[PDB]
């Protein structure tokens, strides 16, 4: 081993240790909103169906408790 190789390696290390990094927060901030609406939009179909069929409001809830001929 010599000093030339070691110095060249040290210089190349510092050279590589200079890559810039741009922002990456707005991407996730927008992806979260693009998914929230896509997930909570389809409920309007069920709401309109329940309001136009015959049953009144209030009884319309969320979860997984089966269904019947009165509550949705």
């Amino acid at each position: 081993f010599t000093l030339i190789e070691l110095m060249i390696v040290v210089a190349i290390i510092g050279i590589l240790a200079a890559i810039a990094i741009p922002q990456y927060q707005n991407y996730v901030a927008r992806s979260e909103g693009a998914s929230a609406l896509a997930t909570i939009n389809p409920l309007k179909t069920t709401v309109e169906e329940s309001l136009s069929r015959g049953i009144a409001g209030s009884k319309i809830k969320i979860g997984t408790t089966a269904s019947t001929a009165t509550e949705t």
């Binding site: 309001l51 136009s52 015959g54 049953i55 009144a56």
Partner: protein, 71 residues
């Protein structure tokens, strides 16, 4: 006995009551457990005068009333 039940149509209930003098009224009352919210508790009626004239009326909104009666 006309061949229709008082609740044949699930949208509402029908009621007839002809008086002895011929005058009477056939009414249809919308139910709250089947009809729409706007057409809930509304009543349509067809009346027969004593002389023998048929008129009709309703209690729904103007835009929802059919093209054959008033409000």
């Amino acid at each position: 006995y006309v061949g229709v039940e008082p609740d044949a149509n699930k949208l509402g209930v029908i009621a007839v009551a002809i008086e002895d003098s011929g005058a009477g009224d056939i009414t249809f009352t919308f139910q709250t457990g089947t009809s729409s919210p706007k057409n809930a508790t509304k009543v349509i009626t067809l009346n027969r005068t004593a002389d023998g004239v048929w008129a009709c009326k309703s209690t729904q909104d103007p835009m929802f009333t059919p093209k054959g009666c008033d409000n």
